[PDB]
Amino acid sequence: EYPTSVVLDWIANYFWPYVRISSMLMVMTVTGARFVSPRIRLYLGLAITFAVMPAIPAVPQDIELLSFRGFMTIAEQMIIGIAMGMVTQFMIQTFVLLGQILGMQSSLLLGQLFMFLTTMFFLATDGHLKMLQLVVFSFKTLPIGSGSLNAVDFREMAGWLGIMFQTALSMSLSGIIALLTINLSFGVMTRAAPQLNIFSLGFAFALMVGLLLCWYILAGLYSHYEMFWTVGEAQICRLIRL
């Protein structure tokens, strides 16, 4: 044999799967966090790619490492990885949306409270393991050589903003109605004497009830997360055509 074929193939058979894996990690909720150093994340991507190597099919040998076609392959591996990563960011920020709408309606940082708890939901439900299982499955059903995200995948991923508001409103509709009715009830009941008004007195009353309602929101938030994850996971499988 000529040693060029052996060495080049392994680099092509390792880095190209790694790029998709690494690109998903940098956009992922947990592995792409600001707390972890890039070096720890880099080693994690290297270790995952090495371990899941047997399940990854051999890349086509037609495309050369030093060629413009190989350059396009690197870019389209990232696009697949970022697609999975953005879905995870969409879910967590939707809960951040849920936290801030309650806080805004509470006459008021509350997004961080929901963001941290939703991160715990992601870790406790083994969401990170499922994403890693999804990306290795992507290697099977969406081969590296022939295959990339089409225009329909971009439009479906661009339509997730409506998914955010609809899901965030659905979670908070019961609480937001409660916030409005008590504030309207407080307004009408104290409207008899225009001397009292509310102003800052209304600020104190609104925030106490808003915090209390957030206590109710956290009581039944887990069920909403489970339904939300199913919607997000289905979108991810649609991207990888599984």
Binding site: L97, G111, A158, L161, G162, F165, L169, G187, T190
Partner: protein, 208 residues
């Protein structure tokens, strides 16, 4: 005559370095972000959608709308170049042309006239104007177009807020802030009409 392999690699790496500029100055990224900036500003949420997801959705939206032009570049320029059918110099020109055509489809005649006189050059056809002058005219048209769409998106939310304020004042409670009451109504009406899907149709299809 054709550039050597070493020089072609240098040009390729250079365009990768300027890649963020090409997205935000030549593609549709500027219009989408500005319009989505208005939508976040129109509703009572200040930073609630957060900057990360807006850019990520904008990037995916651009790849959706730039797919025809990107595929046209792929077919006309990349395929002959990969098959070694054409030289690097003409392949670069064959890739530049679809970008120029797309920027012409999203610009205005008045904007081109201002910059072509500003550059102090001579031309008679808009089709062969230099890309250095087309870029400032393209984004200037994009900013004006985005403000038009954003203004139309801002009106229904202003409509809802004014109605709620009038209702509260008419009921006599001059003490309650309209923003807290109006926010769920703005969000509810944004969801039950599926507002984002409508915005996608009027934004992605606005280029054509």
């Amino acid at each position: 005559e054709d550039y050597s392999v070493t020089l072609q690699i240098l040009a390729l790496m250079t365009m990768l370095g300027f890649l963020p500029a090409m997205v935000i100055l030549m593609t549709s990224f500027t219009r989408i972000v500005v319009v989505m900036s208005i939508l976040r500003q129109a509703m009572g949420l200040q930073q609630t959608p957060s900057n990360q997801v807006i850019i990520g959705i904008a990037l995916f939206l651009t790849f959706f709308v730039m797919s025809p032009v990107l595929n046209e570049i792929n077919d006309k320029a990349v395929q002959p170049y990969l098959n070694e059918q054409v030289t690097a110099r003409e392949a670069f020109d064959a890739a530049q042309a679809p970008m120029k055509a797309f920027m012409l489809k999203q610009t205005r005649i008045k904007d081109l006239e201002t910059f072509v006189t500003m550059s102090g050059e001579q031309v008679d056809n808009p089709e062969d104007v230099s890309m250095a002058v087309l870029i400032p005219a393209f984004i200037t048209s994009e900013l004006k177009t985005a403000f038009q769409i954003g203004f139309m998106l801002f009106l229904p939310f202003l409509i809802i807020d004014l109605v709620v304020a009038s209702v509260l004042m008419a009921m006599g409670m001059m003490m309650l802030s309209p923003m807290i009451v109006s926010l769920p109504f703005k969000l509810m009406l944004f969801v039950l009409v599926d507002g984002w899907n409508l915005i996608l149709s009027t934004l992605a299809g606005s280029f054509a």
